[PDB]
Design a protein around this ligand. Sequence first.
Ligand code: PP3
Ligand code: PP3
Lengths: 396, 396
Amino acid sequence: MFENITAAPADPILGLADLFRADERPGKINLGIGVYKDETGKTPVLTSVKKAEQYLLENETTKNYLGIDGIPEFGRCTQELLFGKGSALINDKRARTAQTPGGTGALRVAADFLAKNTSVKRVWVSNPSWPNHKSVFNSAGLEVREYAYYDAENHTLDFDALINSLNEAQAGDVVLFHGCCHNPTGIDPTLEQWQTLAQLSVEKGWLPLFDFAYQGFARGLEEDAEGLRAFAAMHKELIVASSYSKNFGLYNERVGACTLVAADSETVDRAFSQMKAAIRANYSNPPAHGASVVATILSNDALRAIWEQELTDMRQRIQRMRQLFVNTLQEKGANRDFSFIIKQNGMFSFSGLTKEQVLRLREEFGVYAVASGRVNVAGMTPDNMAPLCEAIVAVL
Amino acid sequence: MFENITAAPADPILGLADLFRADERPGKINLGIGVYKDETGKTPVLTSVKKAEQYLLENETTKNYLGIDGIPEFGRCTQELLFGKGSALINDKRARTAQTPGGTGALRVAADFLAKNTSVKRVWVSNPSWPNHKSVFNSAGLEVREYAYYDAENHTLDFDALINSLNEAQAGDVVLFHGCCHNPTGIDPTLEQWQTLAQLSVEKGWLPLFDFAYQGFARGLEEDAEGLRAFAAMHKELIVASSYSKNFGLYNERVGACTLVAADSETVDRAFSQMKAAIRANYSNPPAHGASVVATILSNDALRAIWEQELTDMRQRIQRMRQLFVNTLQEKGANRDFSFIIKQNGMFSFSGLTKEQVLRLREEFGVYAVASGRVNVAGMTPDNMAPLCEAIVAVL
Ligand SMILES: Cc1ncc(COP(=O)(O)O)c(CN[C@@H](C)C(=O)O)c1O
Ligand SMILES: Cc1ncc(COP(=O)(O)O)c(CN[C@@H](C)C(=O)O)c1O
């Protein structure tokens, strides 16, 4: 039955990992990671989560199944994090959250629910975007269309081409927006742009689907939710898939959520039951551990206070690396201008290097980057900055 | 978009939970649980896992992502558990295991891989079976057909009707077998029956799909794998989905596996890549915690020794409850014969009660059971046995 099965293509990001871990070169740098790293080049487990894990180890009396939608406190907590502490969506109880296996798992459940309980079949994704977005939607049987976003020349959001692209989208179509820290460009709409985007969305009848994977990595927890909150107060319905992989350093515990918002409680409840049915036919119920950690931290202020400080430390380190980067390049001399790097949020950004340049960088200097020229700023340290910038200058 | 969405039907097993937790009656019993319980009526976390969790808390230095297929040791360990320590399938390296979100998650990934990488479209499931089997396969777009199994009158495996049903199945069709402790009947084929089933399977060209969720709950770890091992040595290809929810009391950590076996290494590898692609488009990578716990316990003999004792204690308690049950019934007087209960393996079995009887049992005595008359033996204790049997006798 499997004798003629075709081998799957190598993942653009994942495949690069193995080539890196084979390059025996002394002084090699990997910027195609996609995970946060500290000044030491390590992805440590947060102290606040380590504390939350001790608490659980002492307090858990059972490992009995969670409800299809996971732990209640986790749900309530994510909602307050996303829509605001005193949000109308929360008081009118128009929202329902299901704990899921990471953000990717949240997108797949949203995809299956949508594909089986509604008239949607087209999902609009930006160009470029996280490569796995297409695969997730396609596996659900949904079609993927792309709208313009990036501006190769100015290295900015091409708002006009964006609007122009979305116009061919119809009412009943899903439009996917990155909440903040756009992957792979790091270019995010300003509040005014989010606002016009929210109005256009309401007029055209789009169904907003927010992928919120980096809350707290652009400007702050609340600031980063402005866009989502703009659509939220404007729309009767929307879906938001969130991940706690980055902001909690909980990558491998698969902790995320899928929030469903409807015009009212009666309708949101009826739609949520069908979302639970989609989960039941997938993995049954979600993994408690990582979610348990998030719920205890967010519901205790001693713990939540430590966590917030640990997050701002992470955010600030990335911002310092973008600056150190521009400086060190602009210092090691070369006709160019990487000022746009300082204007971009999060861990990623397009270095503006050509396919050949990134290939030569890898082959000749041991600097590793996604073929698209996507670079992870959190993979840079005060220590590797110089040789890194020297190699880049040598390929310009 | 969600304004006309239909509410999902209540799960036959899950719905009963809420009605139970509403019945304010003093002395109510719930036999529709589907989870193991000790003499106290609690689902404790095993001491061996508690020990493994302490070890992790002290040793983990990162929460960085696992590979799409999870932790290597977990995979190797499950393979030895399933196919035998010195198995040819292991030495010839014809098998590949992916850590997944529980057994249900293993079935869904097998379903998606099958539905997208092969010519299969029909899956044969026994009648009856775990209700979620159909939903999982259907969501993948596969058709579900049922083969005869139970014998309502004799309360046994109707081997002839079974064989007779499978005959209408064609080559290239998937046939689903419960490894041991058949849900909901608890009736399992004898080794001789497994053997003829394995031969017929090879002749007809079926693709075996073993759902192995209760290894260690019928007779022992190895004994319970005899059936699977019979097919394994007979087939060039097969798929096995396993769960560690019951035998490790790790219900809510979602720990399970999907083992893919092909004629050889070269082919199994090519097919596995496509299985990893199916996972990547679902939840990306698996939750480490529960799997980490299983891998450390199974790879340390101090720990593994404690775990095995804890499992035999669980197995023996269930076996004692089936006996105490037959005795107490046959003691509280009533024309019947529940001897078949002692012949069945695992936590479940059909009590042989009518729809009305189970409804009257619930309404009039507070005894709760799945409408199908499925009863969970592990929900019985020396304490509740008498009133339980008294209520049953009163509805005969
Ligand atoms: C936009 C975006 N959405 C969702 C996710 C989902 O992540 P989790 O499922 O792990 O919660 C990621 C992770 N992107 C990483 C993996 C990368 O860009 O390399 C992401 O970049
Ligand atoms: C036959 C069978 N297969 C697979 C599973 C998968 O369980 P996990 O996904 O939790 O690993 C179960 C759990 N059946 C329980 C839930 C019941 O019969 O109530 C089962 O009975």
